[PDB]
Amino acid sequence: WAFGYMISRYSYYPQDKVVELVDIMQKEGFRVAGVFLDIHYMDSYKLFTWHPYRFPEPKKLIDELHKRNVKLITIVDHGIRVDQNYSPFLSGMGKFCEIESGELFVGKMWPGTTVYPDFFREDTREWWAGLISEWLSQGVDGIWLDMNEPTDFSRAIEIRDVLSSLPVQFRDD
Amino acid sequence: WAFGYMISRYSYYPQDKVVELVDIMQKEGFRVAGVFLDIHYMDSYKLFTWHPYRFPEPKKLIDELHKRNVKLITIVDHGIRVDQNYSPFLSGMGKFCEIESGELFVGKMWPGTTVYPDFFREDTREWWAGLISEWLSQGVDGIWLDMNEPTDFSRAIEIRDVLSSLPVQFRDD
């Protein structure tokens, strides 16, 4: 099924619209293997969370998709939000990337201020596998890893803040 | 009396305070020949006007000062406010400075957007003499001409608007 016809967008939501679209596609004769859910499904772009208003009942969505024989693939970025009450941030502590001087590498990504997992380490990899596994257990069929170059926007944003008001054009480096 | 002791400030107001100060000076033995009124006495820095709140009764002030044998000297700048309902602007029309291309030279000074009298012309001189004469007739004893280099702030303000944002410091040219 990974080689079947996949539909995706940035993004499809709320959950009822996802099902409505799949139904119309199938009704008109298109065999859809799976649908991709882009970042709008998350709560404030926080990894491993569901938007409380757009996706109040994810279980219902997964069941509806599976009843229709459609796989669900969810995007997962690499940025962990520096949030005091965000579980992944607290549990991942100790396994994030650092900078030469010893502090954590704090940057900028979709969820705002963020830290990044140091995937080169065994414990980080194990910790991540755990979150993924837990995420897959709801019935999610696939993982879409994005922005994993790895990408960071703190430098770009820093430039945009300092020369924001200046009526000039920035080169695209 | 022009060689006597003059007190001034930028500025003395409202009118009751001007008289109070002169009284204290005289009571303590200082022979004051005259007091200078800086730009705060004008209405929005408009030449030949009295601030409706600080100097609501100019005649009363002048009389109070004259009763105490104290002359009154008022500052008069060279900028005419580009104001649709400002008399000097309307009556001076035709006698203001222009730029090479023919339009009026519109700049910036205390009253904001302003035009300037072309004093090199005899007609402008006659027009100005008229306003001065009319101004002196209330009992004003002297004229203090300021900013008549002539000075203009449109270039400075133009620079400050475009580079206002930059955390950089400007050279004082």
Short mmCIF file of C-alpha atoms in Angstrom, two decimals:
data_model
loop_
_atom_site.label_atom_id
_atom_site.label_comp_id
_atom_site.label_asym_id
_atom_site.label_seq_id
_atom_site.Cartn_x
_atom_site.Cartn_y
_atom_site.Cartn_z
CA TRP A 1 0.00 0.00 0.00
CA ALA A 2 3.00 2.33 0.37
CA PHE A 3 3.14 2.42 -3.43
CA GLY A 4 -0.53 3.30 -3.83
CA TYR A 5 -2.12 6.67 -4.55
CA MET A 6 -1.65 9.03 -1.60
CA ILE A 7 -3.47 12.32 -1.15
CA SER A 8 -2.03 15.07 0.98
CA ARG A 9 -2.10 18.79 1.55
CA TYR A 10 -0.72 21.39 3.91
CA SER A 11 -3.10 20.78 5.43
CA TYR A 12 -6.37 18.81 5.55
CA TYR A 13 -8.61 19.62 8.54
CA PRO A 14 -10.66 19.54 10.68
CA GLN A 15 -11.09 15.76 11.00
CA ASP A 16 -14.60 15.67 9.51
CA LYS A 17 -13.31 17.30 6.33
CA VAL A 18 -10.62 14.64 6.04
CA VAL A 19 -13.25 11.92 5.95
CA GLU A 20 -15.54 13.90 3.66
CA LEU A 21 -12.77 14.28 1.10
CA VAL A 22 -11.81 10.61 1.25
CA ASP A 23 -15.46 9.68 0.71
CA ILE A 24 -15.83 11.89 -2.35
CA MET A 25 -12.57 10.53 -3.79
CA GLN A 26 -13.71 6.93 -3.37
CA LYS A 27 -17.23 7.62 -4.56
CA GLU A 28 -15.86 9.09 -7.78
CA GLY A 29 -13.68 6.05 -8.40
CA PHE A 30 -10.28 7.02 -7.03
CA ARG A 31 -8.57 4.28 -5.08
CA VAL A 32 -6.89 6.11 -2.19
CA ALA A 33 -4.24 4.17 -0.28
CA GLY A 34 -3.60 6.77 2.42
CA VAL A 35 -3.91 10.38 3.48
CA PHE A 36 -1.16 12.53 4.93
CA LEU A 37 -1.83 14.87 7.83
CA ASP A 38 0.44 17.95 7.80
CA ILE A 39 1.28 20.18 10.78
CA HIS A 40 -2.20 21.71 11.21
CA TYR A 41 -3.30 18.56 13.06
CA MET A 42 -1.03 19.29 16.01
CA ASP A 43 -1.79 21.46 19.00
CA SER A 44 0.29 24.62 18.40
CA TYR A 45 2.68 22.54 16.28
CA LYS A 46 3.62 20.41 19.31
CA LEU A 47 4.82 16.96 18.28
CA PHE A 48 2.67 14.02 19.37
CA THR A 49 -0.44 16.09 20.18
CA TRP A 50 -3.81 16.59 18.50
CA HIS A 51 -5.34 20.00 17.91
CA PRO A 52 -8.19 20.19 20.52
CA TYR A 53 -10.60 21.85 18.12
CA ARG A 54 -9.64 20.49 14.71
CA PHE A 55 -9.07 16.95 15.98
CA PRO A 56 -11.13 16.43 19.18
CA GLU A 57 -11.72 12.70 18.47
CA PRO A 58 -8.67 11.21 16.69
CA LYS A 59 -9.77 7.65 17.49
CA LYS A 60 -12.98 8.23 15.55
CA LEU A 61 -10.96 9.57 12.60
CA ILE A 62 -8.62 6.59 12.54
CA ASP A 63 -11.53 4.17 12.71
CA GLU A 64 -13.36 5.98 9.92
CA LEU A 65 -10.25 5.83 7.73
CA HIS A 66 -9.55 2.21 8.48
CA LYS A 67 -13.19 1.27 7.80
CA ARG A 68 -12.61 2.77 4.37
CA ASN A 69 -9.30 0.92 3.98
CA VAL A 70 -7.31 4.13 3.96
CA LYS A 71 -4.00 4.45 5.80
CA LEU A 72 -3.18 7.48 7.94
CA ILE A 73 0.33 8.98 7.77
CA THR A 74 1.20 11.80 10.16
CA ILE A 75 3.98 14.33 9.78
CA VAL A 76 6.51 14.54 12.60
CA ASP A 77 9.08 17.34 12.72
CA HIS A 78 12.30 17.28 14.77
CA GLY A 79 11.69 20.34 16.93
CA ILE A 80 10.71 19.94 20.57
CA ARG A 81 8.94 23.00 21.99
CA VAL A 82 10.64 24.58 25.01
CA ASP A 83 7.45 24.37 27.02
CA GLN A 84 7.40 23.89 30.81
CA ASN A 85 4.29 21.73 30.65
CA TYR A 86 5.03 19.87 27.44
CA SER A 87 5.77 16.21 28.22
CA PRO A 88 8.30 15.44 25.42
CA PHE A 89 10.40 18.42 26.52
CA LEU A 90 10.50 17.19 30.12
CA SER A 91 11.11 13.52 29.28
CA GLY A 92 13.66 14.28 26.58
CA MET A 93 15.70 16.44 28.95
CA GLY A 94 19.30 15.23 28.94
CA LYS A 95 19.08 13.96 25.37
CA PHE A 96 18.96 17.24 23.42
CA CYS A 97 21.66 18.88 21.27
CA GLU A 98 24.04 21.32 22.96
CA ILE A 99 26.41 24.05 21.87
CA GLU A 100 30.19 24.25 22.40
CA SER A 101 29.87 26.11 25.71
CA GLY A 102 27.62 23.48 27.27
CA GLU A 103 24.12 24.96 27.26
CA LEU A 104 21.28 23.44 25.25
CA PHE A 105 21.02 24.52 21.64
CA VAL A 106 17.84 26.59 21.67
CA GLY A 107 16.54 27.55 18.25
CA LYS A 108 13.39 28.37 16.33
CA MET A 109 11.03 26.13 14.37
CA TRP A 110 7.26 25.68 13.83
CA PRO A 111 6.39 25.44 17.55
CA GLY A 112 8.45 28.56 18.30
CA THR A 113 11.41 28.34 20.69
CA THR A 114 12.66 24.77 20.35
CA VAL A 115 15.40 22.29 21.25
CA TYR A 116 16.41 19.30 19.15
CA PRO A 117 17.03 15.62 19.94
CA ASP A 118 20.65 14.56 19.57
CA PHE A 119 19.83 11.49 17.44
CA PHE A 120 23.52 10.55 17.29
CA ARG A 121 23.12 9.20 20.84
CA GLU A 122 21.72 5.77 21.70
CA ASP A 123 19.57 7.03 24.60
CA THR A 124 18.00 9.76 22.44
CA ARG A 125 17.23 7.23 19.75
CA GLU A 126 15.67 4.90 22.34
CA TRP A 127 13.63 7.75 23.85
CA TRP A 128 12.42 8.79 20.38
CA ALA A 129 11.53 5.21 19.43
CA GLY A 130 9.36 5.17 22.53
CA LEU A 131 7.41 8.28 21.58
CA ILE A 132 7.01 7.02 18.03
CA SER A 133 5.85 3.60 19.22
CA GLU A 134 3.33 5.22 21.55
CA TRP A 135 2.17 7.43 18.66
CA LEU A 136 1.77 4.46 16.31
CA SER A 137 -0.32 2.59 18.88
CA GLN A 138 -3.35 4.83 18.31
CA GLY A 139 -3.53 3.33 14.85
CA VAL A 140 -1.35 5.74 12.88
CA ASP A 141 0.05 3.79 9.90
CA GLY A 142 3.07 5.82 8.84
CA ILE A 143 5.53 8.52 9.80
CA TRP A 144 6.49 11.47 7.64
CA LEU A 145 9.72 13.06 8.84
CA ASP A 146 10.08 16.68 7.72
CA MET A 147 12.55 19.57 8.18
CA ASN A 148 15.12 16.99 9.26
CA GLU A 149 18.11 18.40 7.34
CA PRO A 150 18.19 19.46 10.20
CA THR A 151 16.66 22.91 9.70
CA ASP A 152 16.53 25.84 12.14
CA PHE A 153 15.16 29.36 11.68
CA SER A 154 16.71 31.27 14.58
CA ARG A 155 19.38 32.89 12.36
CA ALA A 156 16.87 33.94 9.69
CA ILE A 157 14.49 35.34 12.30
CA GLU A 158 17.34 37.13 14.04
CA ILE A 159 18.13 38.94 10.78
CA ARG A 160 14.47 39.71 10.11
CA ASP A 161 14.10 41.29 13.58
CA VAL A 162 17.13 43.56 13.33
CA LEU A 163 16.63 44.73 9.73
CA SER A 164 12.85 44.38 9.69
CA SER A 165 12.08 48.09 9.44
CA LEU A 166 14.84 48.74 6.89
CA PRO A 167 13.25 49.17 3.40
CA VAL A 168 15.70 46.78 1.73
CA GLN A 169 15.71 43.33 0.16
CA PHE A 170 17.47 40.36 1.75
CA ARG A 171 19.44 37.92 -0.39
CA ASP A 172 18.19 34.36 -0.14
CA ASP A 173 21.10 32.47 1.39
CA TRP B 1 16.27 99.53 28.83
CA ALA B 2 17.59 97.19 26.14
CA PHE B 3 20.82 97.06 28.14
CA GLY B 4 19.14 96.19 31.41
CA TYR B 5 18.79 92.83 33.14
CA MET B 6 16.58 90.49 31.10
CA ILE B 7 15.15 87.22 32.37
CA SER B 8 14.15 84.48 29.98
CA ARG B 9 13.59 80.77 29.71
CA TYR B 10 12.36 78.19 27.26
CA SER B 11 9.78 78.84 28.39
CA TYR B 12 7.89 80.83 31.05
CA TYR B 13 4.15 80.06 31.24
CA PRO B 14 1.23 80.17 31.76
CA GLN B 15 0.77 83.96 31.93
CA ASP B 16 0.04 84.06 35.68
CA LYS B 17 3.40 82.39 36.37
CA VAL B 18 5.19 85.02 34.29
CA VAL B 19 3.83 87.76 36.54
CA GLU B 20 4.43 85.77 39.72
CA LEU B 21 8.09 85.34 38.84
CA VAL B 22 8.55 89.01 37.95
CA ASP B 23 6.97 89.97 41.29
CA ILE B 24 9.28 87.72 43.29
CA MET B 25 12.31 89.04 41.39
CA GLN B 26 11.37 92.67 42.10
CA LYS B 27 10.38 91.98 45.70
CA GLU B 28 13.81 90.46 46.34
CA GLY B 29 15.58 93.48 44.87
CA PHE B 30 16.31 92.51 41.29
CA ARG B 31 15.66 95.25 38.79
CA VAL B 32 14.19 93.43 35.78
CA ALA B 33 14.09 95.40 32.51
CA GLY B 34 12.17 92.82 30.49
CA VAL B 35 11.07 89.21 30.16
CA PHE B 36 11.38 87.07 27.06
CA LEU B 37 8.57 84.76 26.00
CA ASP B 38 9.81 81.67 24.14
CA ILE B 39 7.76 79.47 21.78
CA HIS B 40 5.47 77.96 24.44
CA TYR B 41 3.36 81.13 24.33
CA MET B 42 2.17 80.41 20.78
CA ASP B 43 -0.77 78.27 19.75
CA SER B 44 0.83 75.09 18.37
CA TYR B 45 3.95 77.14 17.56
CA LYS B 46 1.98 79.29 15.10
CA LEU B 47 3.55 82.73 14.66
CA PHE B 48 1.48 85.67 15.85
CA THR B 49 -0.93 83.66 17.98
CA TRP B 50 -1.41 83.14 21.70
CA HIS B 51 -1.83 79.76 23.30
CA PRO B 52 -5.57 79.61 24.25
CA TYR B 53 -4.80 77.89 27.57
CA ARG B 54 -1.48 79.29 28.80
CA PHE B 55 -2.06 82.84 27.51
CA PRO B 56 -5.87 83.30 27.25
CA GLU B 57 -5.57 86.96 28.23
CA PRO B 58 -2.46 88.43 26.59
CA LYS B 59 -3.56 92.03 27.22
CA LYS B 60 -3.86 91.35 30.94
CA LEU B 61 -0.29 89.96 30.99
CA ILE B 62 1.18 92.87 29.03
CA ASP B 63 -0.62 95.33 31.30
CA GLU B 64 0.62 93.53 34.43
CA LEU B 65 4.20 93.64 33.14
CA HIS B 66 3.93 97.27 32.05
CA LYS B 67 2.45 98.25 35.40
CA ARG B 68 5.64 96.83 36.94
CA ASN B 69 7.73 98.71 34.40
CA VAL B 70 8.87 95.50 32.72
CA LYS B 71 9.18 95.18 28.95
CA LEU B 72 7.83 92.15 27.07
CA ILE B 73 9.89 90.62 24.26
CA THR B 74 8.36 87.82 22.19
CA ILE B 75 10.17 85.27 20.08
CA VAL B 76 9.24 85.08 16.42
CA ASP B 77 10.53 82.27 14.22
CA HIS B 78 10.62 82.33 10.41
CA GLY B 79 8.44 79.31 9.71
CA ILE B 80 4.89 79.73 8.48
CA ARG B 81 2.68 76.73 9.17
CA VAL B 82 1.11 75.15 6.07
CA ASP B 83 -2.34 75.39 7.61
CA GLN B 84 -5.52 75.91 5.55
CA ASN B 85 -7.09 78.09 8.24
CA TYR B 86 -3.99 79.93 9.39
CA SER B 87 -4.18 83.58 8.34
CA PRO B 88 -0.44 84.31 7.80
CA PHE B 89 -0.22 81.33 5.45
CA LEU B 90 -3.15 82.58 3.37
CA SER B 91 -2.06 86.25 3.32
CA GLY B 92 1.59 85.43 2.70
CA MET B 93 0.73 83.30 -0.31
CA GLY B 94 2.74 84.47 -3.30
CA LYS B 95 5.61 85.71 -1.14
CA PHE B 96 7.14 82.42 0.06
CA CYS B 97 10.39 80.74 -0.98
CA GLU B 98 10.29 78.31 -3.92
CA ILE B 99 12.48 75.54 -5.29
CA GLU B 100 14.13 75.33 -8.72
CA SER B 101 11.18 73.49 -10.29
CA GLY B 102 8.66 76.15 -9.29
CA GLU B 103 6.70 74.70 -6.37
CA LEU B 104 6.82 76.21 -2.89
CA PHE B 105 9.66 75.11 -0.68
CA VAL B 106 7.85 73.05 1.95
CA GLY B 107 9.95 72.07 4.94
CA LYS B 108 9.78 71.24 8.64
CA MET B 109 10.13 73.50 11.68
CA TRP B 110 8.50 73.96 15.11
CA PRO B 111 4.93 74.24 13.76
CA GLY B 112 5.40 71.12 11.62
CA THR B 113 5.06 71.34 7.85
CA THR B 114 6.07 74.90 6.98
CA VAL B 115 6.87 77.38 4.22
CA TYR B 116 9.23 80.33 4.54
CA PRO B 117 8.97 84.01 3.60
CA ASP B 118 11.30 85.04 0.78
CA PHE B 119 12.67 88.09 2.65
CA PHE B 120 14.83 89.02 -0.34
CA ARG B 121 11.69 90.42 -1.98
CA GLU B 122 10.41 93.90 -1.16
CA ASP B 123 6.75 92.81 -1.13
CA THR B 124 7.47 90.04 1.39
CA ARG B 125 9.31 92.59 3.49
CA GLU B 126 6.26 94.88 3.41
CA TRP B 127 3.93 91.95 4.24
CA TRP B 128 6.13 90.88 7.17
CA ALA B 129 6.47 94.46 8.45
CA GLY B 130 2.67 94.56 8.53
CA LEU B 131 2.34 91.44 10.68
CA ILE B 132 5.10 92.66 12.98
CA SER B 133 3.52 96.09 13.30
CA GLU B 134 0.15 94.51 14.09
CA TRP B 135 1.88 92.28 16.65
CA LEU B 136 3.65 95.22 18.30
CA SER B 137 0.37 97.13 18.60
CA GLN B 138 -0.85 94.89 21.44
CA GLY B 139 1.93 96.39 23.51
CA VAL B 140 4.75 93.94 22.80
CA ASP B 141 8.02 95.85 23.30
CA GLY B 142 10.55 93.79 21.37
CA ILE B 143 11.08 91.09 18.77
CA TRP B 144 13.39 88.10 19.21
CA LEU B 145 14.18 86.50 15.84
CA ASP B 146 15.27 82.86 16.17
CA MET B 147 16.20 79.96 13.85
CA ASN B 148 16.77 82.54 11.12
CA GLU B 149 20.01 81.09 9.70
CA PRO B 150 17.65 80.06 8.05
CA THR B 151 17.17 76.62 9.58
CA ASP B 152 15.05 73.72 8.35
CA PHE B 153 14.61 70.20 9.74
CA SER B 154 13.06 68.31 6.84
CA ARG B 155 16.36 66.65 5.86
CA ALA B 156 17.16 65.59 9.42
CA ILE B 157 13.65 64.24 9.93
CA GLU B 158 13.77 62.43 6.61
CA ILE B 159 16.91 60.58 7.77
CA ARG B 160 15.42 59.85 11.18
CA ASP B 161 12.31 58.30 9.57
CA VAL B 162 14.19 56.01 7.18
CA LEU B 163 16.87 54.80 9.62
CA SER B 164 14.93 55.28 12.86
CA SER B 165 14.86 51.51 13.37
CA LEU B 166 18.59 50.81 12.99
CA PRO B 167 20.35 50.38 16.37
CA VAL B 168 22.99 52.60 14.77
CA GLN B 169 24.08 56.11 15.76
CA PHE B 170 24.06 59.09 13.39
CA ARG B 171 26.95 61.48 12.89
CA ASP B 172 26.06 65.05 13.79
CA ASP B 173 26.44 66.95 10.53
#
